[PDB]
Amino acid sequence: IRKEENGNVTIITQNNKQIRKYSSTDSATTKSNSKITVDASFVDDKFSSEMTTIISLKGFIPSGRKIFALSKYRGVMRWPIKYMVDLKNNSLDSSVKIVDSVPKNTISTKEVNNTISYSIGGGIDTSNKASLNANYAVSKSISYVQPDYNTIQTNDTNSIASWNTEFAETRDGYNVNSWNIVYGNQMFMRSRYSGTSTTNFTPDYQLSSLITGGFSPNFGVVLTAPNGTKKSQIEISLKREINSYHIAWDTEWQGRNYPDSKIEETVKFELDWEKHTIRQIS
Ligand SMILES: [Zn+2]
Ligand SMILES: [Zn+2]
Ligand SMILES: [Zn+2]
């Protein structure tokens, strides 16, 4: 397959048949300083019965971690047990559809690599693997990291694709279910007999970057639309759940994780299928 560049246009030729790809990028910042970036690739394929747009979602959700002493004998580490991302298609009434998305099902690897491949005619192939060793007319790579976390697709329909990236288990084998009758839950406990109430949490170099910094998701969807479609809408929601991991000293440190708070923010984007643009609206 031959491809050639012309700014935001890629002319793709495969066996006498030619298609075009138009790129559009928009960025938005939320009230709580979460970041969302959408890369839309509008495909123009006269040999396909409909219009196809591939959307790459890249974001940053701050961990919101805080460490403070309740007293000399009780310390608290607030941390993001769960990150949630929704891409909602608001135009199913106009028969605009999400026809595929990645990641699929559940992914547990520290590094996530997905691939969205388009074939002339409309065909779509989605892989939870990396590529790009195949001769697809258009392939889009998706990649992010999630040390100590897992990602599950909780919704996968024409109307919505949803992902939960939730804490799984520490390297030492502790999770939110761990309970030792003496030391309680020790998932983020640096030691059982040392440190102060704000000094005895797992050092930063031994915590997931999702806890020390934040989550940098990269997810993907594919939308289709009837040939004449001018505009459609999507909504992207970023959600973070914070928990409070308490350590309390009796004659040793005892650990316990409590629920705390949830923050959800939503950004709206309009797709102009004629001008090949994606713009935040509202
Ligand atoms: Zn077009
Ligand atoms: Zn699927
Ligand atoms: Zn605008």
Numbering used by the authors: 9 to 290
Question: What's the publication's text?
Answer:
Clostridium perfringens Delta toxin is one of the three hemolysin-like proteins produced by C. perfringens type C and possibly type B strains. Delta toxin itself is cytotoxic to the wide range of human and animal macrophages and platelets that present GM2 ganglioside on their membranes. It has sequence similarity with Staphylococcus aureus β-pore forming toxins and is expected to heptamerize and form pores in the lipid bilayer of host cell membranes. Subsequently, they oligomerize on the cell surface to form prepores that insert amphipathic hairpins into the lipid bilayer to form an oligomeric β-barrel pore.
It includes a monomer of Delta toxin, comprising 282 residues (residues Ile9 to Ser290), 139 water molecules, three glycerol molecules, one imidazole and three zinc molecules. C. perfringens Delta toxin structure has an elongated ellipsoid shape composed of eighteen β-strands and three short helical fragments: two 310 helices and one α-helix. These secondary structure elements are arranged into three structural domains: a β-sandwich domain, a stem domain and a rim domain. In Delta toxin, the N-terminal residues form a β-hairpin that extends halfway along the β-sandwich domain and creates a cap above the folded, monomeric stem domain residues. This deletion means that Delta toxin does not possess a Tryptophan (residue 177 in LukF) that is important for phosphatidylcholine binding in the S. aureus proteins. There are three glycerol molecules bound to the hydrophobic region of the rim domain. One of the glycerol molecules in the Delta toxin structure is interacting with the Arg200 residue, and, it is likely that, in analogy with these related proteins, Arg200 in Delta toxin is important for cell surface recognition.
